[PDB]
Structures are given as structure tokens and as C-alpha cells.
Design a protein around this ligand. Structure first.
Ligand SMILES: [Zn+2]
Ligand SMILES: [Zn+2]
Ligand SMILES: [Zn+2]
Ligand SMILES: [Zn+2]
Ligand SMILES: [Zn+2]
Length: 142
DNA sequence: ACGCAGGTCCTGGACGAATT
DNA sequence: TAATTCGTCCAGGACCTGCG
């Protein structure tokens, strides 16, 4: 049960050359499941079917509390915690709690003080790109 | 004013689970 | 069993919003 074929990208082992060639598609994209609309590629056909809803607008996960629908069950699961006031994610530095996992991760970056987004017009630095994009709209109004 | 930051939800890669 | 397909988590955003 040895394995002699290795991937020069991630280092995973395979017992047959054909097994290595099939796995190597995740690094080059060749022969991956390709969307017929935008021609983007994904890891397997199930991830492709999830992406298909981005073109059709289908939201098959509806909240039974307010009636709003979502594209993914994970998004619905996160949304339901809003109705119940469930905030399991907390910042270990200041104690601020969030129901959204990304809101907590985004908040914790503020304790580092890093502002890697600098305005190309005036040089004002921002910790988030979306706030810089909104700031540049003020510049757009000449 | 408008920078700041939390609210909200869409998007997709990661990865074990379930199916074929 | 091996390969494919699926479910799920989770990271990374974009758009919206009100506060100081
Ligand atoms: Zn590899
Ligand atoms: Zn597509
Ligand atoms: Zn709801
Ligand atoms: Zn904090
Ligand atoms: Zn500027």
C-alpha cells in the first residue's frame, strides 16, 4: 500500500499516476467543472451547482420567522441567530460580542491598528477597503 | 461632514461526510 | 474500496446603515 507519485504543488501522495493527474486539476484548473454561463471553474460539480444560483437568483433557504430567503443554508443559519439574539462570537480583547462570525473577525483587526488601504488622491489610510471606496466617491464629486 | 464601524448577506475554497 | 458528489464550516469580502 505504498505511494510513489507526489504533487509538486501541495505534496500529497498517490498510488497511481492517473490519480495524481486527476488531483493536479485543482492547481491548473484544466478539466475542472466549468460553468456554462461565466466559464469559471470549481473544485467539484456540487460547488458548481451552488454557483449556478448566482446567475439565476435562486434563494432556496427561507427563514420561517420573517420570510426572507438566502442563497445558502449557512447564511440562513447565521441570519436566524439575529432573531434569537444569539451572539456566540466575542472579541477576546475588548469583550464585544457578535452574532456574525465575519463581523467578529473584522472587528478584531481594529485592535492591530493596521490600515493597509491608502487613498491614491490624498493619502488617507483606511483599515477597510469598502470605507476607502466610499471615501473615493467624495473625491469623485470634484 | 464624513470617517468609523457594526449590520447584513452573498460568494466560494476547504474538507470531512455521504453517495455512487 | 475508490471515486465522485454532497453538506458544512468558515474566511473574505460588498453593500447598507447610523453614530460621534
Ligand atoms: Zn496538489
Ligand atoms: Zn457562472
Ligand atoms: Zn428571518
Ligand atoms: Zn475587540
Ligand atoms: Zn482621499
Amino acid at each position: 500500500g505504498s505511494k510513489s507519485f507526489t504533487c509538486d504543488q501541495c505534496g500529497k501522495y498517490f498510488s497511481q499516476k492517473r490519480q495524481l493527474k486527476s488531483h493536479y486539476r485543482v492547481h491548473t484548473g484544466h478539466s475542472l467543472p466549468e460553468c456554462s454561463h461565466c466559464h469559471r471553474k470549481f473544485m467539484d460539480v456540487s460547488q458548481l451547482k451552488k454557483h449556478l444560483r448566482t446567475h439565476t437568483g435562486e434563494k432556496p433557504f427561507t427563514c420561517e420567522i420573517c420570510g426572507k430567503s438566502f442563497t445558502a443554508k449557512s447564511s440562513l443559519q447565521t441570519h436566524i441567530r439575529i432573531h434569537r439574539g444569539e451572539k456566540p462570537y466575542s472579541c477576546s480583547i475588548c469583550g464585544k460580542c457578535f452574532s456574525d462570525s465575519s463581523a467578529k473577525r473584522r472587528h478584531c483587526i481594529l485592535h492591530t491598528g493596521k490600515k493597509p488601504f491608502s487613498c491614491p488622491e490624498c493619502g488617507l489610510q483606511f483599515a477597510r477597503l469598502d470605507n476607502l471606496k466610499a471615501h473615493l466617491k467624495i473625491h469623485s464629486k470634484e
